[PDB]
Design a protein around this ligand. Structure first.
Ligand SMILES: C=CC(=O)OCCC[C@H]1O[C@@H](n2c(NCc3ccc(Cl)cc3)nc3c(N)ncnc32)[C@H](O)[C@@H]1O
Length: 384
């Protein structure tokens, strides 16, 4: 009978996504909870190891032993100043083992340490499993995506993570390249410059690629490793903490549960503001038994985040300088990442490019896995 399909995996910093190309189209595969993306989280508890949604769901009750952001560590030396800085903000412990970082947790009443690629292999095992549940057979072939700025060590560590997960890694391909492939930008048949604008939950990446007769070349990478959707959630939280202080003469900041409930409501209101011009938040007994009701306009949220949204143009200008290109030399614009749904973000980018269209019809959280699935089917065909 027909041979097993190959899968395309977007191994993201905080979320992952798996796709399969069958019958001339991409199927993004839903997980056991019916979700088209899965958190890249591994939680270690007194009795089990949780991966994906189950791990993300219990993070508030187990922060020291719920690992995320292993992609920020992967292929890096412990001594890397990026590792040393990032370590200061994680709830989990990072240890040194011969200039190699290991995440250290408590698991089944014992201290255990894992290399970043071991954590990533667990998230890859989950994506493999999600695909197998849908396909009804074992999956062994995969394309895995990485950021375009990844060096030899980071690319290799990701490949190691796939081989530990029991995958034959067909190719490690760049995330912006996968996004360009999802939009069929390699199927035009001369040379074109493409810009990928990737704004996620906690990272911002700009990449400039050249496409010449289906061949891709990375021309520039720029961005801000600590800029994303969470920062816009932070601006809303700070605004409402101040509004509560003004209206009730109480500071909710020192109550961990109140701050979490407020943050969760702020992230939901922010998403509403991408399709509505106003959003209401209501939280019963937020603090001191007070039911908190509030409202915010899209205009006020845009003002609260003005400098952050406006700062996304600096890596665009920077990538253009590095690629030695004028903005008029960019043929295609591609949006990736959940935060690109923000109207003001789209407006800033489009206006900067003198009204050029944005390639955004493919769900921005699924575009990379979509392109990885397309490329996996081409590569498994050639290898066979
Ligand atoms: C959730 C699955 C997933 O893979 O997330 C990856 C992207 C995560 C980041 O992207 C942000 N973001 C998103 N995300 C998609 C989303 C989120 C949650 C739900 Cl319930 C549904 C859909 N949509 C948005 C929207 N309409 N406007 C503004 N920011 C939006 C979200 O606040 C977070 O900073």
């Amino acid at each position: 009978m027909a041979k097993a399909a190959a899968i395309g995996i977007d191994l993201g910093t905080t979320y992952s996504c798996v796709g399969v190309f069958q019958h001339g189209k991409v199927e993004i595969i839903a997980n056991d909870q019916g979700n088209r993306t899965t958190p890249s989280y591994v939680a270690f508890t007194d009795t089990e190891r949780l991966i994906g949604d189950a791990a993300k769901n219990q993070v508030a009750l187990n922060p020291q032993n719920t690992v995320f952001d292993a992609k920020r560590l992967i292929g890096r030396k412990f001594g890397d100043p990026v590792v040393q800085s990032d370590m200061k903000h994680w709830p989990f412990q990072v240890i040194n083992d011969g200039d190699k970082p290991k995440v250290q947790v408590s698991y089944k009443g014992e201290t255990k340490a894992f290399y970043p690629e071991e954590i990533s292999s667990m998230v890859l095992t989950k994506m493999k499993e999600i695909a197998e549940a849908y396909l009804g057979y074992p999956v062994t072939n995969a394309v895995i995506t990485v950021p375009a700025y990844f060096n030899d060590s980071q690319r290799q560590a990701t490949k190691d993570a796939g081989v530990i997960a029991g995958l034959n890694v067909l190719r490690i391909i760049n995330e912006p390249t996968a996004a360009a492939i999802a939009y069929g930008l390699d199927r035009t048949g001369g040379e074109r410059n493409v810009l990928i604008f990737d704004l996620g939950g906690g990272t911002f990446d700009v990449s400039i690629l050249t496409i010449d007769d289906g061949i891709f070349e990375v021309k520039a990478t720029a961005g801000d490793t600590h800029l994303g959707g969470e920062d816009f959630d932070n601006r809303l939280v700070n605004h409402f903490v101040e509004e509560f202080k003004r209206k009730h003469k109480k500071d909710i900041s020192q109550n961990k549960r109140a701050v979490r409930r407020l943050r969760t409501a702020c992230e939901r209101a922010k998403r509403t503001l991408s399709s509505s011009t106003q959003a209401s938040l209501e939280i019963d007994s937020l603090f001191e038994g007070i039911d908190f009701y509030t409202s915010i306009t899209r205009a006020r949220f845009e003002e609260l985040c003005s400098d952050l949204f406006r700062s996304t143009l600096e890596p665009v200008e920077k990538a253009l300088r590095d690629a030695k290109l004028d903005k008029a030399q960019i043929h295609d614009l591609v949006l990736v990442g959940g935060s690109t749904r923000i109207p003001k973000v789209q407006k800033l980018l489009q206006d900067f490019f003198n009204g050029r269209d944005l390639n955004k019809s493919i769900n921005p959280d699924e575009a990379v896995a979509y392109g990885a699935a397309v490329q996996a089917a081409i590569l498994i065909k050639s290898t066979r």
